[PDB]
């Protein structure tokens, strides 16, 4: 269940800028089933702070409407692991990224969701291979992927 | 998009009896998202009629409740292809089965959903491999799998 793959030698400054949530998977179906499931979040932009923390802009459907949400991930001892304040303190692990095209990540509390991010609104078969193979290891029960048209809309409608 | 894998030399009498919908995937996320999505159907039992048609018992969530539904699939020229009466006349294709453990199928109208069925409430990694690899070919955007506990409940709650 635990995630035991992280990016060796991650430079968090190089993941700054725009991303698309091409695909997402989670351990429990109810975390992603509906448009307003808890972890159905669409990534807009990564903004690393100078002090090394990560700021995230994303979209989340709630109250029948697509909201913008800004969120702050705090660094830890490990460069590929970050921390998000909540009801219960969640972890974000960076699995892999080539900076220029794709980045794979997971978040944990036991529950768990992961995502394949890409720089452009295109179906990258390669990044998807890598995403599937990192997931093989994990106990997933729901997976979503989206098309180029959907990737350009708010909340992937 | 089209399904171009079918079981060679299918004997429809040998798939009679009990099955579990271990996993399901579809081309559009809305066909499977909610408990009452159109193609979120859980297979209970296969009953082949003497004249070669297939009778299916299944469970479908609707009106906030888990209903039993009986359904009838009519044979065609091809042993692995069957036909279900509806608003629009749908096809059911049998991709693969070893009769004793697993059976993979898809249904078509363009929309498309497939399933990995198994005889017992157990996670069969093998049948899942075969399911993933038959799906590789197809344009899927939502996938669900269920655990042994869920497999014994009505509507996989
Ligand atoms: C390094 C890139 C990681 C991107 C992580 C995105 C953060 C997702 C947190 C999801 C928690 C729900 C958001 C909320 O509504 O508060
Ligand atoms: C050979 C085994 C094939 C099993 C096929 C199951 C039939 C699924 C039909 C789904 C259509 C919706 C059912 C309904 O509510 O009318």
Author numbering:
A (entry chain A), B (entry chain A): 1 to 109, 115 to 162
Please give me the paper's original passages concerning this structure.
Bovine β-lactoglobulin (BlgB) is a small protein (18.3 kDa) belonging to the lipocalin family. Due to BlgB ability to bind different classes of bioactive compounds, its application as a nutrients nanotransporter or drug carrier is currently an object of intensive studies. As other proteins from lipocalin family, BlgB can be re-engineered to gain specificity of binding selected bioactive ligands, and this requires heterologous protein production in the appropriate expression system. Detailed studies, presented below, revealed the presence of uncleaved N-terminal methionine and endogenous fatty acid tightly bound in the binding pocket which significantly influenced properties of the recombinant protein and affected binding of pharmaceutical agents.
To eliminate N-terminal Met, we have engineered two mutations (L1A/I2S), which were designed according to more recent findings by Frottin et al.. The new lactoglobulin variant carrying substitutions L1A/I2S at N-terminus (sBlgB) has been produced and purified by two different protocols. The sBlgB purified by protocol #1, based on the method proposed by Ponniah et al., had spectroscopic properties corresponding very well to milk protein and crystallised in the conditions typical for natural protein. The space group P3221 and unit cell parameters of sBlgB crystals correspond very well to the trigonal form of natural bovine β-lactoglobulin. The crystal structure was in agreement with MS results, indicating that N-terminal methionine has been successfully cleaved (determined m.w. was 18,211.7 ± 5 Da, while the calculated was 18,213.05 Da). Electron density maps confirmed that disulphide bridges, between residues Cys66–Cys160 and Cys106–Cys119, are correctly formed, so the applied system of BlgB co-expression with DsbC works efficiently for lactoglobulin sequence carrying mutation L1A/I2S. Similarly to previous structure, electron density maps revealed the presence of a ligand in the β-barrel, even though no ligand was added to protein solution and crystallization drops. The electron density in the binding pocket was similar to that observed in the structures of lactoglobulin–fatty acid complexes, and it has been interpreted as a myristic acid. However, ITC tests were constantly showing a very low stoichiometry of SDS binding, with the values similar to the observed for rBlgB. These results indicated that the binding site of sBlgB#1 was probably occupied by endogenous ligand.
